[PDB]
Amino acid sequence: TGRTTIAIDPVTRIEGHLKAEVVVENGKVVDARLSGGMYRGFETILRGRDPRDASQIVQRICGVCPTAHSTASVLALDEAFGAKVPNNGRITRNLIFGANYLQSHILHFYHLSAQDFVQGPDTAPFVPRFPKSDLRLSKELNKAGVDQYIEALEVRRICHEMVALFGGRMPHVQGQVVGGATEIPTKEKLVEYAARFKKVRDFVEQKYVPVVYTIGSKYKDMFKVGQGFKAALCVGAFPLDNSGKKHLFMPGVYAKGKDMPFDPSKIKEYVKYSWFAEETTGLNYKEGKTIPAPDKAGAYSFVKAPRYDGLSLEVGPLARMWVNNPELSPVGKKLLKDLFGISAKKFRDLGEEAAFSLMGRHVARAEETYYMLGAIEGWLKEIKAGEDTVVMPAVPASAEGTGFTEAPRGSLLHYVKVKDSKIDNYQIVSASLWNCNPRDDMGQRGAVEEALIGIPVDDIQNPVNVARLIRAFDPXLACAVH
Amino acid sequence: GERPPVFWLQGQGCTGCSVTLLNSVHPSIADVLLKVISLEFHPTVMAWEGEHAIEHMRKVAEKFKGKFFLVIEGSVPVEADGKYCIIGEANHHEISMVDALKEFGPNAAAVLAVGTCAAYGGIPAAEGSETGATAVSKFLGDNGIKTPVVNIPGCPPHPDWIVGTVVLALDAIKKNGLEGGLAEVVKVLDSDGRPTPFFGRNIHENCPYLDKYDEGVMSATFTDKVGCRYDLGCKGPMTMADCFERKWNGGVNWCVQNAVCIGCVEPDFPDGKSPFYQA
Numbered sequence: 048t049g050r051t052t053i054a055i056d057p058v059t060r061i062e063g064h065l066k067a068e069v070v071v072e073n074g075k076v077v078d079a080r081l082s083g084g085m086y087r088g089f090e091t092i093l094r095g096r097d098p099r100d101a102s103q104i105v106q107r108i109c110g111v112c113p114t115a116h117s118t119a120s121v122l123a124l125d126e127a128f129g130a131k132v133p134n135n136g137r138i139t140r141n142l143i144f145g146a147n148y149l150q151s152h153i154l155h156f157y158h159l160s161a162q163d164f165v166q167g168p169d170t171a172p173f174v175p176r177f178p179k180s181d182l183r184l185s186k187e188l189n190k191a192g193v194d195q196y197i198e199a200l201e202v203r204r205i206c207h208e209m210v211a212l213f214g215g216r217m218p219h220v221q222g223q224v225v226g227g228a229t230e231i232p233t234k235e236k237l238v239e240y241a242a243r244f245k246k247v248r249d250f251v252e253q254k255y256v257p258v259v260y261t262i263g264s265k266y267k268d269m270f271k272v273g274q275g276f277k278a279a280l281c282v283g284a285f286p287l288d289n290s291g292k293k294h295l296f297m298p299g300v301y302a303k304g305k306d307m308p309f310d311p312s313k314i315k316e317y318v319k320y321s322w323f324a325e326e327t328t329g330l331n332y333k334e335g336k337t338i339p340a341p342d343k344a345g346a347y348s349f350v351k352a353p354r355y356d357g358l359s360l361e362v363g364p365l366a367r368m369w370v371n372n373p374e375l376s377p378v379g380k381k382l383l384k385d386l387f388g389i390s391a392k393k394f395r396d397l398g399e400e401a402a403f404s405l406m407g408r409h410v411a412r413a414e415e416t417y418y419m420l421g422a423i424e425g426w427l428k429e430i431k432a433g434e435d436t437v438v439m440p441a442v443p444a445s446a447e448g449t450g451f452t453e454a455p456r457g458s459l460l461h462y463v464k465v466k467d468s469k470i471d472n473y474q475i476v477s478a479s480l481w482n483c484n485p486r487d488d489m490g491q492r493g494a495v496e497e498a499l500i501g502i503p504v505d506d507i508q509n510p511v512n513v514a515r516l517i518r519a520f521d522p523x524l525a526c527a528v529h
Numbered sequence: 530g531e532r533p534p535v536f537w538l539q540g541q542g543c544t545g546c547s548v549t550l551l552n553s554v555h556p557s558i559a560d561v562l563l564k565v566i567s568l569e570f571h572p573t574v575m576a577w578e579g580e581h582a583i584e585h586m587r588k589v590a591e592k593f594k595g596k597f598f599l600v601i602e603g604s605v606p607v608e609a610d611g612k613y614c615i616i617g618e619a620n621h622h623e624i625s626m627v628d629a630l631k632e633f634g635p636n637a638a639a640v641l642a643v644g645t646c647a648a649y650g651g652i653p654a655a656e657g658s659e660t661g662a663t664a665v666s667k668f669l670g671d672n673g674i675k676t677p678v679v680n681i682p683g684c685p686p687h688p689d690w691i692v693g694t695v696v697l698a699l700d701a702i703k704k705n706g707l708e709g710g711l712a713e714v715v716k717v718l719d720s721d722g723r724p725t726p727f728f729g730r731n732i733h734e735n736c737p738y739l740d741k742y743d744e745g746v747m748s749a750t751f752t753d754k755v756g757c758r759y760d761l762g763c764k765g766p767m768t769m770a771d772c773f774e775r776k777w778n779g780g781v782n783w784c785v786q787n788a789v790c791i792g793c794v795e796p797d798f799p800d801g802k803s804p805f806y807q808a
């Protein structure tokens with residue numbers, strides 16, 4: 048068969064404003080463009096402010112992952128100010144932020160992604176939908192998915208209670224500032240956090256991780272599509288001591304079948320196909336500039352195009368779990384054997400092709416959730432009730448700092464330059480920026496654009512696999528554009 | 530009874546309004562969606578996508594003309610002919626937030642502007658912005674659209690403020706009809722469009738640390754929870770909200786206990802509440 052061109056705007060069951068346009072020929076995607084259609088301009092709004100305001104302002108980039116921006120911002124401020132965060136504040140920050148990993152991954156699989164494979168109740172917002180939605184689960188297993196969707200609503204709410212115990216509230220924590228965390232954990236509130244954590248752990252181990260492998264086993268064809276560049280980025284996250292060298296996720300780049308170190312000087316943001324002034328293309332974040340140009344011919348997105356030494360990389364759970372190669376959960380090992388016939392001990396035992404796939408990214412996210420449980424368990428043993436968590440540094444007149452972390456959806460950095468005790472420049476290079484960006488100046492596609500190539504579309508009237516692929520990356524266009 | 534149709538349109542928002550609503554305890558969000566409202570369009574959670582999702586909303590809007598509720602999250606950017614916020618595409622034409630509000634605004638029973646961005650402009654309209662970010666009520670008024678607007682601000686709002694205002698409005702309409710009930714709702718809005726049950730009282734005047742404020746006992750570090758937070762930047766004196774007793778996230782904390790209030794419900798947030806960390 049010939050060509051059909053399909054535009055999807057809005058792509059739903061993601062966060063934010065995204066149009067996807069694919070060219071389908073002979074039943075497969077052969078080209079793709081992603082367009083982020085909403086811009087706010089945090090990088091210019093921030094200029095001239097007290098630098099400490101940043102760790103509140105930047106959270107409003109995104110209400111799903113605000114703790115990630117809070118973290119990147121206070122780390123950047125920590126560096127710029129010379130703030131020496133007390134050890135107990137490092138742990139408290141990890142407890143605040145780690146709890147939202149659990150919230151975000153559970154939200155993404157059940158409340159954003161699961162309807163790709165499960166038919167919800169016969170009322171809005173679960174209907175109407177594609178008449179041929181390719182929903183393969185038995186009546187029993189479908190009902191189980193709906194029941195878990197409903198239970199997961201309570202579980203993700205409990206995760207935000209965990210965030211708020213030491214973060215003040217959620218969305219948009221008050222509890223992280225330059226210098227550490229604003230509230231010393233008490234024994235009483237640590238028991239409250241732990242009791243909620245136990246309920247989340249049970250759900251993750253008994254329902255979430257098993258259901259992802261189980262649904263995946265009914266959709267084994269979805270491990271054979273969505274490979275894209277098979278190239279990934281991790282910048283490191285969640286320090287496990289004050290050395291600055293040991294982290295729950297260690298940094299690394301993976302491309303063309305090779306592991307390589309991460310050098311942040313290799314990051315450049317291109318804008319040829321983005322609605323920004325042509326003269327701003329090719330800037331490292333330390334010299335970044337944000338000059339919107341919504342009428343620029345040929346551009347098709349408010350997302351800049353980040354490249355790592357010219358490479359187009361993806362970010363997120365798959366990227367982190369591939370780069371770090373942790374041992375698989377007990378659940379995963381067993382169901383990989385029983386349901387897939389796969390003998391695996393570590394994450395990379397999935398194989399590059401299966402890991403870098405539509406369903407592989409859902410599996411990585413589930414495995415990572417399980418991985419995070421162990422980290423939070425350790426922090427709950429490490430934290431000292433009553434030990435101070437903050438220092439109160441003076442605002443410098445002149446300074447710069449960069450904060451690197453991993454948001455639930457992938458690598459995040461904030462760069463701040465202070466002059467006359469105010470923000471002179473603030474540049475954000477976020478997770479869904481790396482995934483959902485347009486072509487760079489030489490025409491090389493962004494990671495999701497490339498992963499769409501080869502996606503099957505047997506029925507152009509029900510092109511469900513296009514957005515299925517996109518949702519596997521858990522996109523957040525508010526983060527991508529800011 | 531029949532749950533009213535609701536369209537949830539996101540302009541220049543961060544989705545924090547939707548997320549805060551997901552944290553509702555009583556009623557739960559499942560109860561809200563299955564028993565209180567019929568959420569016919571919401572890009573974050575709905576099953577369908579693309580032009581089909583847009584066309585579904587238009588079909589519902591036609592069928593329930595004058596009777597659906599429009600929730601607007603985020604501000605409405607008017608610069609560059611609306612191109613700073615495109616929310617969909619149908620019949621080969623892009624739909625800006627400007628277009629959408631002009632299309633559905635006139636035909637809604639009421640507009641609920643949820644969050645400070647939608648209510649007052651918020652961070653997207655703050656100093657350094659250049660998209661023409663505009664509050665919902667201002668945009669509708671500037672364009673001659675007379676549909677009643679209820680502001681439920683906060684960055685984000687508390688879930689109870691959103692759900693509670695919906696319940697209050699639906700109660701009014703049950704007992705007085707649509708026009709009678711909406712008249713009653715408007716009567717309990719303050720001059721900034723906020724329902725007085727949640728926004729009629731001042732944080733500082735009802736703050737548990739007011740005794741320390743009066744005594745001049747001020748915390749010098751965030752982790753000192755004995756003193757008043759004023760010197761650390763607390764904006765409670767200029768903020769109208771019930772967080773002092775409602776608390777957040779199931780009652781586990783609130784901003785003043787944990788750090789400082791930043792005045793997130795106020796029309797001048799953020800610029801009139803900044804710098805956040807000095808008085």
Ligand code: SF4
Nearest residue numbers: 733736757758763765
């Ligand atoms: S300044 Fe803040 S902490 Fe102090 S009494 Fe007023 S509201 Fe409470």
Ligand code: SF4
Nearest residue numbers: 772784790791792793
């Ligand atoms: S305490 Fe202040 S900053 Fe916190 S939610 Fe209430 S009004 Fe907003």
Ligand code: FCO
Nearest residue numbers: 112454455456479526
């Ligand atoms: N997670 C998350 Fe948000 C995105 N993309 C950031 O950074």
Ligand SMILES: [Fe+2]
Nearest residue numbers: 474475476529
């Ligand atoms: Fe940026």
Ligand code: NI
Nearest residue numbers: 109112523526
């Ligand atoms: Ni985000």
Ligand SMILES: [S]
Nearest residue numbers: 109111112523
């Ligand atoms: S996000």
Ligand SMILES: [S]
Nearest residue numbers: 112114115147
């Ligand atoms: S986050």
